Amino acid sequence: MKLNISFPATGCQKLIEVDDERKLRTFYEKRMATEVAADALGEEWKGYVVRISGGNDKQG
Amino acid sequence: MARGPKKHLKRVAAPKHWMLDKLTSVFAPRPSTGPHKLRECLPLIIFLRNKLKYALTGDEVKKICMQRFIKIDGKVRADITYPAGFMDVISIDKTGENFRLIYDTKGRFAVHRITPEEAKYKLCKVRKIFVGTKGIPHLVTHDARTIRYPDPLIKMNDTIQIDLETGKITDFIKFDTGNLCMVTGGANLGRIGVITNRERHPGSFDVVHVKDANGNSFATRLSNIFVIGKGNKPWISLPRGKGIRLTIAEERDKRLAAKQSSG
Amino acid sequence: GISRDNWHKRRKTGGKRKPYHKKRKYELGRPAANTKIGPRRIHTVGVRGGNKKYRALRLDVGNFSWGSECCTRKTRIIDVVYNASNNELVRTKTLVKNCIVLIDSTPYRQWYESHYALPLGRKKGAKLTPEEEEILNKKRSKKIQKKYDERKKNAKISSLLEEQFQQGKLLACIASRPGQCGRADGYVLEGKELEFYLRKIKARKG
RNA sequence: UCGCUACUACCGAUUGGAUGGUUUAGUGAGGCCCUCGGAUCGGCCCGCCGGGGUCCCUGGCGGAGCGCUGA
RNA sequence: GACGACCCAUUCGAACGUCUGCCCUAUCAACUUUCGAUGGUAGUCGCCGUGCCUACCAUGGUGACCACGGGUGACGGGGAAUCAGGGUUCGAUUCCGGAGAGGGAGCCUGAGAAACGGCUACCACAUCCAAGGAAGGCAGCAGGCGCGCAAAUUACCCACUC
RNA sequence: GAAACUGCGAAUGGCUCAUUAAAUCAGUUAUGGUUCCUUUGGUCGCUACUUGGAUAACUGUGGUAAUUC
Ligand SMILES: [Mg+2]
Ligand SMILES: [Mg+2]
Ligand SMILES: [Mg+2]
Ligand SMILES: [Mg+2]
Ligand SMILES: [Mg+2]
Ligand SMILES: [Mg+2]
Ligand SMILES: [Mg+2]
Ligand SMILES: [Mg+2]
Ligand SMILES: [Mg+2]
Ligand SMILES: [Mg+2]
Ligand SMILES: [Mg+2]
Ligand SMILES: [Mg+2]
Ligand SMILES: [Mg+2]
Ligand SMILES: [Mg+2]
Ligand SMILES: [Mg+2]
Ligand SMILES: [Mg+2]
Ligand SMILES: [Mg+2]
Ligand SMILES: [Mg+2]
Ligand SMILES: [Mg+2]
Ligand SMILES: [Mg+2]
Ligand SMILES: [Mg+2]
Ligand SMILES: [Mg+2]
Ligand SMILES: [Mg+2]
Ligand SMILES: [Mg+2]
Ligand SMILES: [Mg+2]
Ligand SMILES: [Mg+2]
Ligand SMILES: [Mg+2]
Ligand SMILES: [Mg+2]
Ligand SMILES: [Mg+2]
Ligand SMILES: [Mg+2]
Ligand SMILES: [Mg+2]
Ligand SMILES: [Mg+2]
Ligand SMILES: [Mg+2]
Ligand SMILES: [Mg+2]
Ligand SMILES: [Mg+2]
Ligand SMILES: [Mg+2]
Ligand SMILES: [Mg+2]
Ligand SMILES: [Mg+2]
Ligand SMILES: [Mg+2]
Ligand SMILES: [Mg+2]
Ligand SMILES: [Mg+2]
Ligand SMILES: [Mg+2]
Ligand SMILES: [Mg+2]
Ligand SMILES: [Mg+2]
Ligand SMILES: [Mg+2]
Ligand SMILES: [Mg+2]
Ligand SMILES: [Mg+2]
Ligand SMILES: [Mg+2]
Ligand SMILES: [Mg+2]
């Protein structure tokens, strides 16, 4: 699964793609409107916390 | 289906006194909702192209009416299917002519030009009387008008002469035995004569008699009498031949003698 | 839905009729309100031609009137005792028209006292002394007989009524469909209706 | 009467076949009503900053009960 | 002047109700009822009258003047063909009334719908697929298959009536 | 002045005759037992020099083979 990251501050976004499910466990078994740290996303996100805002399914 | 109100009117089913042809096309103008009943009205479109010949097709009526030329009781009507009716006074300023809708004696409307010092008042027939809130007495005429504070002697079936810039009734004729009357329903349509009688069958359609200027008498229903004069003296002007309803054996003779086959 | 059509049921002769059309909307049914007692819960429904219509569930207060004295006061509703059509509405305390209820009767006491300067159903003379006697006896001398003798020869509350205030609960009859006006109003029992319903309650239950 | 050839309907082992409608008993999708439920989103109550005035009122950032209240 | 708005009237209606009026059948003579059938009292519900529906009570209502059941290649009427006088047969069909959008059912929105050129579900059909899913209703106008003795072009245009 | 929010209309019109025999329908009457968009006429007096937050079109990133998603 890919991600659609957004930054409401300056108004920009980027569709990133990951495959190592290791960096995906931060989301699994969670709901919408919850917040979570992106520390497991990579070295570039350290003090980064982001809110899950929904998405699409397989089949859309 | 019918689940709501209809809005078209078929040419055959239209009223007869509109004197419409048969082979133009399937529909007829279908007068819009107004103060006059659907069978008793005459839409403005039928008055300008079938009678006065001013226009030729529906669009010409629409672009005559849009320029704000036509006035129905002082006000300026822009709806071409507006339901004009008995005692309404069309005024065409740009020409300087006026008309009064009155039944001709064959039982249909006809053009009847009136003097502009007359087209300032119209008659109405009283339909209801009631005391509103706080004790104010009201009035309802045949064309839906509501007059507040009328004189406390005007009652049902009477006639009242109003003005077109104020309402505010001026004179009133009282329904009783001896006054003039014009008849506005059924077989005797457009006849005139003194009332001369009224029988009263309680709970059903009281009957009224009349008597022409030639002895001819003809009953009617009371809900079809319309007083237009104090007695033998009609207030409003009258069409030629004055509701006398001559028989066909007389209509033939006048046609032959006048030999009205040309001009 | 549910419907109030005539055509679903058979004619004088006992013969069936075959269905004439699908159920129309103007034959509409909708379910019962079943007003209980409790804190207010009024819903609304849209009926033919706009025209809000307030359905009432869980009512508590009623604008009851006292015909002889021309009084009428918003009063708490205590209970239902007798239902003249079906009895299992008093077992479940549903509050419909021409029910029979017990109300609180306090504001009528207050009005009667303050108007006639007299006591209604009391127990003793100890509780009336610390307060509320400052209202029964006054500064007044002019007024205090100039009008309060006009209030004498008239304070003759009936025995059947007077016996009720000693408990503070009055028998009343609903005169409004709660399920269509949201309100539960009515009047308080007088005269011979009182004897009727006293007999009926004592007869059936208990 | 018996015998020939054509045609028409009848009874009938099969307890014929199909089709459609009735109907007791049992299950019963979906909407409406009611009694609950409460994902989630707000506002007012405590700091720092900017405006007024004598610490309060506004606007914003953050956090403590998130207390209460609304949908 | 345009717009909006409470209530009253008026208009276009709509809804319910009164009297009289129907083709064939006795190889249909008794029917109707706690699964409301006729009536009374009080309510529920509904836009209002009403067994319309619930609770208690009474035992009623219809029939040889044809009830009730069955059949109709039965949608009703204005009308059509023939016709000395009387009649017989026809009326799917351009005007008026009713009913229905494959069959049954439920509802949203609205002044107005139990609406299908609206939505939801079952029944019967049928289309697309990456087999996860999605989509449908010509008894509107043309057109096609089928059915049958039996019925026209997948044209043009809002100029006329509205 | 495209688009888009808002209002209105889409319940008329057209097509067919399966159902349906006191039903539908016709003439006759009644709503004093009801509702009524619209039109027509009445009715309009027990921070104010003007309040609140939040959406579409538009910009930008998207998912499914597929749809007026
Ligand atoms: Mg139609
Ligand atoms: Mg329909
Ligand atoms: Mg019109
Ligand atoms: Mg309304
Ligand atoms: Mg043989
Ligand atoms: Mg044989
Ligand atoms: Mg046989
Ligand atoms: Mg069988
Ligand atoms: Mg079965
Ligand atoms: Mg069941
Ligand atoms: Mg369910
Ligand atoms: Mg259910
Ligand atoms: Mg609740
Ligand atoms: Mg709650
Ligand atoms: Mg009864
Ligand atoms: Mg009743
Ligand atoms: Mg019997
Ligand atoms: Mg008998
Ligand atoms: Mg029968
Ligand atoms: Mg026939
Ligand atoms: Mg048939
Ligand atoms: Mg003949
Ligand atoms: Mg016909
Ligand atoms: Mg046929
Ligand atoms: Mg045809
Ligand atoms: Mg028709
Ligand atoms: Mg009719
Ligand atoms: Mg078909
Ligand atoms: Mg609407
Ligand atoms: Mg439908
Ligand atoms: Mg349609
Ligand atoms: Mg659809
Ligand atoms: Mg579907
Ligand atoms: Mg279609
Ligand atoms: Mg076709
Ligand atoms: Mg062939
Ligand atoms: Mg042929
Ligand atoms: Mg063929
Ligand atoms: Mg045109
Ligand atoms: Mg729009
Ligand atoms: Mg609309
Ligand atoms: Mg049917
Ligand atoms: Mg029958
Ligand atoms: Mg039958
Ligand atoms: Mg009848
Ligand atoms: Mg009729
Ligand atoms: Mg009738
Ligand atoms: Mg409009
Ligand atoms: Mg107005």
TrEMBL record, chain A:
It comes from the Eukaryota. Component of the small ribosomal subunit. Part of the small subunit (SSU) processome, composed of more than 70 proteins and the RNA chaperone small nucleolar RNA (snoRNA) U3. Component of the 40S small ribosomal subunit. Plays an important role in controlling cell growth and proliferation through the selective translation of particular classes of mRNA. Part of the small subunit (SSU) processome, first precursor of the small eukaryotic ribosomal subunit. Belongs to the eukaryotic ribosomal protein eS6 family. This is 40S ribosomal protein S6. It comes from Oryctolagus cuniculus (Rabbit). The chain holds residues 1 to 60 of 249 of the full protein.
